[PDB]
Amino acid sequence: ATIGRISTGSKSLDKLLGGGIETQAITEVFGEFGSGKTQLAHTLAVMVQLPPEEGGLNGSVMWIDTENTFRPERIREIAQNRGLDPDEVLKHIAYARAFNSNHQMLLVQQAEDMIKELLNTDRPVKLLIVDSLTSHFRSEYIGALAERQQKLAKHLADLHRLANLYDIAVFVTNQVQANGGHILAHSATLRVYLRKGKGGKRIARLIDGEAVFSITEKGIED
Ligand SMILES: Oc1cc2ccccc2cc1O
């Protein structure tokens, strides 16, 4: 398949990304608590449902939530201010809460079943969100870094296999703050560092210029 792109909602961020986040890729956004990673996830879950002329892929979404941070009412707001019907947008987001890191890993295998079901339809899965990818692994493997890295490596490999095999954009969030971080090392296809700037602006930089945007009723925008 050709590489598809999903607009982030921000022209600035899209330019930094060469058009948007890519299918057949894992995009990892990392930064401190409150930097806006989950807002970017919510925005992408709407944008992907637009036609390509507006920066989407007419795609369906699968969302794995590890922190109970998915907000359907926020999806509705973004959809309504992106000219889409909010009920339709929500009907095309499959949502699951991961109870722990082992359940999170099983949910990726389950996602493949729905991906296959939708593959030949007019609304194939085009976006798989894992928010937060690292939170359960970090809390469960305190004092056991070597074992944590083994499990994370397999999880990321599963996500790669889905991105490439089914032409999906995988978008993952990772909280990194004071003294923290192996990030995801070199595993993601693309690492985006997100931070707060003056006056509520958000600033993004590729790790391995900078885009600037705001969180609004449209999700994010310049
Ligand atoms: O109905 C489902 C929703 C999911 C969401 C994310 C990951 C896996 C899922 C599996 C489902 O059957």
> Distances in Å between the alpha carbon of 99 and those of 63, 68, 102, 154, 198?
14, 10, 8, 18, 36
CA 201 to mean position of chain CA atoms: 20
The structural domain count of the chain equals 1
- In ligand 1, the atom with minimum distance to the C-alpha of 95 is 5
The partner residues of 29 in beta bridges, in order of sequence, read: 173, 192
Which one-letter amino acid corresponds to residue 127? L
205 three-class SS:
strand
Which residues line the pocket of ligand 1, CB cutoff 6 A?
62-64, 94-96, 107, 110-111, 114
**Domain membership of residue 155 as a residue range:** 1-222
Secondary structure (H, E, C), 163-178: HHHHCCEEEEEEECCC
- Dihedral sign from CA coordinates of 11, 16, 21, 24: positive
Q: What length does the chain have?
A: 222
Cis (ω within 30 of 0) for the bond into 132? yes
Q: Which helix (H) or strand (E) holds 36?
A: none
The resolution of the experimental structure, rounded to one decimal in Å, is: 1.4
| Angle in degrees, CA 134, 94, 89, rounded to 5 | 115
Amino acid identity of residue 41, one-letter, is: A
Method of determination is: X-ray
Residue 52, classed as helix, strand or coil, is helix
Q: Per DSSP, what are the bridge partners of residue 25? A: 169
The token pair at 142 is 């305190």
Residue 179 Cα to ligand 1 middle (Å): 34
Yes or no: say if 196 and 188 are a contact pair by the CB < 8 Å rule. Answer: no
Burial 83-118 (b: 16+ CB within 10 A, else e): ebebeebbebbbebebeebeebbebbeebbeebeeb
Helices (H), the chain: 11-16, 37-47, 72-80, 86-91, 101-118, 135-140, 145-166
Instruction: Determine how many CB atoms are found less than 10 A away from the CB of residue 71.
Output: 14
**Which atom of ligand 1 lies nearest, measured to the CA of 64?**
6
Residue 19: what residue type? G
Half-sphere exposure of 158 (CA within 13 A, CB side): 18
Partners of 192 in beta bridges: 29, 206
Return the DSSP state at 12: H
> For residue 95, which phi and psi values (nearest 5 degrees)?
-125, 135
Phi, psi (5° rounding) for residue 163?
-55, -50
Is residue 190 within 8 Å of residue 174, measured between CB atoms? no
Please name the amino acid found at residue 117: E
164 CA distance to ligand 1 centroid (A)? 19
